[PDB]
Amino acid sequence: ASSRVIVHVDLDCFYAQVEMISNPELKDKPLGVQQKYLVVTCNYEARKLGVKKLMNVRDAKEKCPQLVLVNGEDLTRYREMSYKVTELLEEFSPVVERLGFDENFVDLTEMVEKRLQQLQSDELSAVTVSGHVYNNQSINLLDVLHIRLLVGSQIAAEMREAMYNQLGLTGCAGVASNKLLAKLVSGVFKPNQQTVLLPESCQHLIHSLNHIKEIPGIGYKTAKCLEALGINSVRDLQTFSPKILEKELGISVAQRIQKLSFGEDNSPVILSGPPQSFSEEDSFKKCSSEVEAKNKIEELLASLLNRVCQDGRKPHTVRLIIRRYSSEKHYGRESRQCPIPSHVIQVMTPMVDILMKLFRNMTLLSVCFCNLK
Amino acid sequence: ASSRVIVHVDLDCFYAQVEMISNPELKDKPLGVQQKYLVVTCNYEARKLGVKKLMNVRDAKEKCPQLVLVNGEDLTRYREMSYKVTELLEEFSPVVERLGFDENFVDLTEMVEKRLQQLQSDELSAVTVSGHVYNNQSINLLDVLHIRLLVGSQIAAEMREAMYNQLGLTGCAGVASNKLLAKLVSGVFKPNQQTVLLPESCQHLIHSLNHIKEIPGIGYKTAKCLEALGINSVRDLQTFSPKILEKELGISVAQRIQKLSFGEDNSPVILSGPPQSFSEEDSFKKCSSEVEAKNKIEELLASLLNRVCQDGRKPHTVRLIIRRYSSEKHYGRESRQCPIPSHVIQVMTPMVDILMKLFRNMTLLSVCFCNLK
DNA sequence: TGGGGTCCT
DNA sequence: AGGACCC
DNA sequence: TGGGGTCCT
DNA sequence: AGGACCC
Ligand SMILES: Nc1ccn([C@H]2C[C@H](O)[C@@H](COP(=O)(O)OP(=O)(O)OP(=O)(O)O)O2)c(=O)n1
Ligand SMILES: Nc1ccn([C@H]2C[C@H](O)[C@@H](COP(=O)(O)OP(=O)(O)OP(=O)(O)O)O2)c(=O)n1
Ligand SMILES: [Mg+2]
Ligand SMILES: [Mg+2]
Ligand SMILES: [Mg+2]
Ligand SMILES: [Mg+2]
């Protein structure tokens, strides 16, 4: 129960793919998906002209005035497609982990070994790779670990062909020995391709990063913190002092991110199953008076109710969130949780009141249904 | 799936019972179990002389200078007996809920109905009660609800006989239609007896209380809050305004405690199963220097390790707690959680360090192992 | 600088 | 409740 | 005023 | 993390 074969599957310009499938006339045209003033993502034709992900409409448009834009505020369709993709990956192997709407990890370890036991003592010399090999590294067919990672590159290719054939979506995959590597290597060949990482090239991959905020797990916060100590490259982090780090982020934050800086990462691929929550969010900077704005709350609920319904499970908690304005508070949402009266659980009318009263004990508003059962 | 038959089982002077079984020479002598300066509980011979639960050693001793005292700081034995009792109740019906070391709720609804279907259309006129009937109320053998509550009083009597015969422990039981009533009525006949609550006497029971802090669920906090509004008796609470209450404790705290004030309570008896946590706590007011005091931390761990071990499940988190001194801060413990390094999970040496470092990011100290799996 | 979503403390 | 991290 | 323990926000 | 509630 030690060496693993994990794949990370990461779809191409996901929202824009889904919009291009819905309206084919958007193909071959540079496309951006807008949400308020933000171009959240764009198709590859777009990125050729300079549009980057999370550009504002303005910069997007003055970098490329020929850009089509469609609204992506409503996530319904993306969320549906997102689950269609996870469910299809669950068929290859039950344990799939989601990350956002367009990433999935799958532990292919049991699958690879079953395939290897089916191959006679002869064809195993014919095992080939599918896709790119990170760093152009040579394969060694007598290396058991190379053989398992190639077999894993083949399962990957089959998952991508099925995603294409069955749902019409393209994507990249990365095959590696842990989740951190598999995700870092799935991006090496961007558009609709896959890459496999052999152990000998782990260090090359991790040292190819230009700053530790590129390591999955180190976010906006730890990043500035690590800086304050002089730690800027992944090597700085590798060689920095455990004690001084240990004692400045807590043994947890520290002992973990240091392992990552080496490419080491033992977290298991967890089963995501159905969501732990369902929320809708509306935005209207400056428009929320602070009484005239409740009707918005009934807006969110209308959809929420129909969604939560469907899954089936009924939520046993509700939550309401906000955010106020003037200077850049960087950080500042407020909320009030509350249990969903048991009668209310088995419709719209009351909810409004819970929320309204929940509203008073209290830029933008949202509603979350959690604690599903 | 509506009317229930629930029993609440509540053992007599639990710690002192266990001490009297271990040292029979303590029988018939007034006994108090001490923890530091507190007489946490005493046997009934004691309470005759004035010793009340949670009296200080002094008041206990000047109220009764003939009082034997044994130390009950180490809970090991009480905890063992506590699980022996729950496991024996689980045999009658799988769903047992614990509350503290000496209370258990059991939903006897399915059991009662199975027994009623086994009784021919004749002996059912002979169904009798076992124990006291709260308020001396008359039974009506044609009342299906009376019949089910009597059958439930019989299951209760059988559980108490088994607790006695199998583990040597006596206790009280209360049979009622929900958890709140079953617990309120289990105390009406204190020492080693049982009482059953028929629906017609619910109001009499609930109005027999002298203040709302006597209702399970209303604690030290809500109590003072309800006061601030004039709400003192259970009737005040019953008749107080939902809105003004709703909006002063939150719709949750309010809509719930108001139901309780009526005797209404729909919470289901939950399965407690194995514990969600294991902790040890040591006390030494004023003795913790704030470096000389870590050895204490290794004390707690020694036992913890052996305990957590046993259950089997390994904890995936550790926690360390404190509390400082001068004026009565009423309220004031501090803690720092931290994940238990995976290598450490499958021994003593490191733990100490996690705790020590956990100790520095930081009257008494403790260690908790949680997040079992 | 959107609209979601997960787990920890 | 709020924080941190991810897409 | 002990030494535990549970669930919520 | 801390709060509230229970034994
Ligand atoms: N901060 C973020 C990150 C992403 N997304 C949405 C828009 C994307 O379509 C989708 C997936 O995130 P990715 O980083 O994968 O972006 P893409 O799939 O769109 O692009 P790529 O093709 O570079 O993987 O999630 C978002 O709304 N907000
Ligand atoms: N604040 C509290 C409450 C109780 N206990 C311990 C000592 C008791 O023996 C046991 C059970 O609590 P009870 O209220 O049931 O007290 P008793 O069983 O001891 O007495 P009774 O016979 O009145 O039920 O838990 C405790 O240590 N601290
Ligand atoms: Mg992605
Ligand atoms: Mg993507
Ligand atoms: Mg009790
Ligand atoms: Mg008791």
Side-chain angles (χ1 to χ4, degrees), chain A residues 203-220 222-238:
Chain A
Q203 287 310 308
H204 182 285
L205 214 203
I206 192 70
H207 280 304
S208 62
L209 310 179
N210 290 304
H211 202 297
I212 42 202
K213 207 258 194 189
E214 295 185 356
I215 293 166
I218 304 169
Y220 187 54
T222 53
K224 295 308 168 185
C225 298
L226 285 155
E227 288 177 38
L229 297 84
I231 306 170
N232 300 282
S233 56
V234 174
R235 198 173 306 274
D236 291 319
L237 174 51
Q238 288 192 162

Side-chain angles (χ1 to χ4, degrees), chain B residues 44-121 123-220 222-246 248-290 293-313 315-321:
Chain B
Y44 283 79
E45 239 29 299
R47 304 191 185 189
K48 277 168 190 189
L49 284 84
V51 186
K52 292 291 182 74
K53 299 200 293 282
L54 307 159
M55 217 154 246
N56 339 276
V57 142
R58 274 167 51 198
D59 299 24
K61 250 154 35 182
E62 87 169 56
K63 215 75 164 166
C64 159
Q66 51 295 37
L67 194 57
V68 186
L69 286 171
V70 322
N71 191 270
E73 263 149 50
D74 189 353
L75 306 195
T76 297
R77 316 188 316 184
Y78 311 145
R79 177 202 295 125
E80 289 163 355
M81 199 66 24
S82 191
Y83 281 93
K84 292 194 173 176
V85 171
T86 298
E87 286 174 41
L88 187 189
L89 299 179
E90 292 168 309
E91 210 179 307
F92 284 74
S93 171
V95 183
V96 173
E97 184 177 344
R98 323 171 104 230
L99 219 210
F101 285 6
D102 89 322
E103 290 177 43
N104 287 268
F105 292 97
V106 180
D107 183 322
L108 294 180
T109 298
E110 282 175 38
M111 211 174 144
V112 166
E113 251 288 303
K114 163 193 187 189
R115 295 189 168 193
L116 278 181
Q117 291 174 2
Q118 233 62 198
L119 290 187
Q120 55 166 301
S121 350
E123 34 198 16
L124 175 154
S125 313
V127 166
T128 55
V129 77
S130 172
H132 302 254
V133 171
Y134 181 73
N135 200 35
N136 190 57
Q137 203 189 309
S138 280
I139 295 156
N140 183 324
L141 293 174
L142 301 174
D143 197 311
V144 64
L145 294 173
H146 286 25
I147 284 299
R148 290 173 194 284
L149 299 163
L150 310 183
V151 175
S153 77
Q154 286 156 35
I155 311 313
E158 282 155 30
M159 293 180 157
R160 294 193 301 111
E161 243 311 318
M163 286 181 274
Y164 187 67
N165 291 326
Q166 288 188 41
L167 306 172
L169 295 173
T170 60
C172 296
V175 173
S177 77
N178 66 225
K179 292 203 283 172
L180 186 223
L181 275 4
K183 177 166 186 175
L184 281 180
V185 78
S186 52
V188 178
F189 290 94
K190 287 280 300 205
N192 152 41
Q193 297 172 74
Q194 68 187 70
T195 302
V196 53
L197 173 72
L198 301 190
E200 290 73 11
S201 298
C202 172
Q203 287 310 308
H204 182 285
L205 214 203
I206 192 70
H207 280 304
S208 62
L209 310 179
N210 290 304
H211 202 297
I212 42 202
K213 207 258 194 189
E214 295 185 356
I215 293 166
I218 304 169
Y220 187 54
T222 53
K224 295 308 168 185
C225 298
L226 285 155
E227 288 177 38
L229 297 84
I231 306 170
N232 300 282
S233 56
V234 174
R235 198 173 306 274
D236 291 319
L237 174 51
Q238 288 192 162
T239 53
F240 200 77
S241 167
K243 310 272 193 170
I244 317 178
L245 195 59
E246 216 164 291
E248 186 95 31
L249 292 178
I251 200 161
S252 173
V253 177
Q255 193 179 167
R256 171 169 47 75
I257 66 171
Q258 194 165 86
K259 291 302 293 296
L260 290 187
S261 86
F262 287 86
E264 267 150 42
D265 160 44
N266 64 31
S267 67
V269 171
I270 291 309
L271 209 166
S272 289
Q276 311 295 54
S277 46
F278 293 82
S279 73
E280 307 261 321
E281 203 168 300
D282 229 341
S283 205
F284 35 45
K285 305 287 209 52
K286 320 180 147 185
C287 289
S288 177
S289 79
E290 289 163 63
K294 129 190 186 166
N295 302 73
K296 311 303 228 90
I297 293 186
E298 309 199 353
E299 287 252 318
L300 307 163
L301 270 59
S303 307
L304 289 167
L305 270 71
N306 200 298
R307 288 217 273 137
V308 156
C309 190
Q310 285 274 178
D311 169 49
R313 300 130 50 211
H316 281 201
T317 299
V318 82
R319 175 194 316 226
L320 285 123
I321 311 164

Side-chain angles (χ1 to χ4, degrees), chain A residues 73-85:
Chain A
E73 263 149 50
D74 189 353
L75 306 195
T76 297
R77 316 188 316 184
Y78 311 145
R79 177 202 295 125
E80 289 163 355
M81 199 66 24
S82 191
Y83 281 93
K84 292 194 173 176
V85 171

Side-chain angles (χ1 to χ4, degrees), chain B residues 10-16 35 40-41 44 47 53-54 101-103 190:
Chain B
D10 182 333
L11 269 36
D12 317 307
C13 55
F14 187 44
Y15 289 0
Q35 287 182 323
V40 72
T41 185
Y44 283 79
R47 304 191 185 189
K53 299 200 293 282
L54 307 159
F101 285 6
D102 89 322
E103 290 177 43
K190 287 280 300 205

